[PDB]
Amino acid sequence: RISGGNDKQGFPMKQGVLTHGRVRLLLSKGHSCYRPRRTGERKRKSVRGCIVDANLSVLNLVIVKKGEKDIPGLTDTTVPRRLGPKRASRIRKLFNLSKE
């Protein structure tokens, strides 16, 4: 799965913007590529499109389908999940605990 990365001027991709160049977009809370400072702040940023060209720095790639081969950096070492569940219901679902 191609999750999208950075333009070669550094500007991040924008999930579903449907161009191949950079757009100036009036971004807000609950958007990609924008963290607001004041409550309600709404700045105009440069974001690169979703159509992948030879005009990129880095693509972000998430491998869904596990294939034939082992691959030396990815699938060799496993890092265990740093934190376990905290909420009682999530612990109850994980360990398959009953409700008594």
Question: Which one, of 37, 35, 49, lies nearest residue 7 by Cα?
Answer: 49
The b-or-e profile of 12-47 (16+ CB within 10 A means b, else e) is: bbbeebeeeebeebebeeebebbeeeeeeeeeebeb
Q: Which is nearer to RNA, 68 or 98 (CB)?
A: 98
Is residue 4 within the footprint of RNA (CB under 7 A)?
Answer: yes
Residues 46-85 contacting RNA, CB under 7 A: 46, 57-58, 60, 62, 79, 81-85
Can you give the binding site for RNA, defined by CB under 7 A?
Answer: 3-13, 15, 22, 24, 26, 28, 32-35, 37-46, 57-58, 60, 62, 79, 81-90, 93, 99
